[PDB]
Amino acid sequence: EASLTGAGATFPAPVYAKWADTYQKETGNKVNYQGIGSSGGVKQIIANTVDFGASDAPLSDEKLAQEGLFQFPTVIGGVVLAVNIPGLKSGELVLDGKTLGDIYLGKIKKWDDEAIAKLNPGLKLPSQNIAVVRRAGGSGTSFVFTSYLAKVNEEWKNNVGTGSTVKWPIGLGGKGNDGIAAFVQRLPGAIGYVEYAYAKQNNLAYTKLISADGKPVSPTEENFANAAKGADWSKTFAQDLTNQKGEDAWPITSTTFILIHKDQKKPEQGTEVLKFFDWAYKTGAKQANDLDYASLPDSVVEQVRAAWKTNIKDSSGKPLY
Numbered sequence: 001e002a003s004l005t006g007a008g009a010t011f012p013a014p015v016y017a018k019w020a021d022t023y024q025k026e027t028g029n030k031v032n033y034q035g036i037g038s039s040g041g042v043k044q045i046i047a048n049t050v051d052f053g054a055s056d057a058p059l060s061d062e063k064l065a066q067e068g069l070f071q072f073p074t075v076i077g078g079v080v081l082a083v084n085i086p087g088l089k090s091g092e093l094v095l096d097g098k099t100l101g102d103i104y105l106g107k108i109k110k111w112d113d114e115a116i117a118k119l120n121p122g123l124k125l126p127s128q129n130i131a132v133v134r135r136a137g138g139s140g141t142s143f144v145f146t147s148y149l150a151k152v153n154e155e156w157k158n159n160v161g162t163g164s165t166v167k168w169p170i171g172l173g174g175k176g177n178d179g180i181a182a183f184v185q186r187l188p189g190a191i192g193y194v195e196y197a198y199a200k201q202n203n204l205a206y207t208k209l210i211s212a213d214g215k216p217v218s219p220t221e222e223n224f225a226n227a228a229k230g231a232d233w234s235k236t237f238a239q240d241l242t243n244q245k246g247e248d249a250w251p252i253t254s255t256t257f258i259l260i261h262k263d264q265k266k267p268e269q270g271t272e273v274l275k276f277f278d279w280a281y282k283t284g285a286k287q288a289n290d291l292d293y294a295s296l297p298d299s300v301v302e303q304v305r306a307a308w309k310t311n312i313k314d315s316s317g318k319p320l321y
């Protein structure tokens with residue numbers, strides 16, 4: 001029985017913890033995962049203070065080669081806009097990318113702005129102030145959210161850009177996906193972006209969004225998967241799944257990565273990290289699905305397995321898988 005430690009992205013923490021809990025019950029192995037944020041996850045793996053780092057934002061091939069890291073995706077999730085608008089139920093409100101950007105730009109301050117009214121003709125929107133909430137530190141969720149906004153709002157693109165950290169025009173800072181859920185839940189009129197599981201598990205109302213194709217879509221596990229159907233994984237694991245074309249493609253979709261060293265100095269730990277993730281691909285789909293994360297296609301996991309065999313070695317060049 002092994003004792004493993006990972007750290008990073010809170011985006012997939014609900015499913016990683018669930019997998020960790022089950023894995024221990026079935027095998028005795030203990031995986032301790034700390035949701036500290038993608039930025040921290042990256043610093044820890046590079047500082048070798050954990051067996052595996054987790055980040056929603058992918059490292060480039062050059063950056064991976066420079067740090068001697070290997071990156072592989074695990075699941076597909078989606079970012080949603082959780083809202084606390086009194087008198088509205090979950091899924092009722094529809095926003096489009098331009099309008100979401102303008103709210104984040106501080107250009108739209110009330111819930112009954114003409115712009116929101118236009119997207120929701122049948123709606124009785126309150127003249128409530130919009131309380132924008134965003135991440136306090138380095139966040140992979142911020143990375144995918146800002147990647148999406150830059151694509152749909154030119155002013156955001158030109159003035160704030162994309163990143164795990166950006167100079168937010170307005171908004172209160174929340175710590176972690178959990179912190180944003182808690183803020184929205186306590187601030188009437190709040191809008192915050194969270195990985196879907198955090199909204200559902202906290203009973204937060206969320207909005208629908210309009211697809212790249214121009215259609216209103218609801219955030220569901222299937223719609224997260226739809227957004228990835230067109231990804232050429234054979235080309236690279238570092239797929240941009242934001243604003244993807246296709247029917248029922250949730251527009252703010254993203255996979256998330258695990259980072260491990262290619263040259264394993266503690267090969268026993270490395271072998272065990274691999275087994276845990278292999279077990280998760282082999283047996284963790286239902287648990288990911290229960291939490292509304294979509295599984296990667298089998299073809300991708302096979303690609304990942306082949307890359308493990310080729311890339312992960314001990315200091316004697318012996319593969320660990």
Ligand SMILES: [Cl-]
Pocket residue numbers: 037135136137138139174175176
């Ligand atoms: Cl944060």
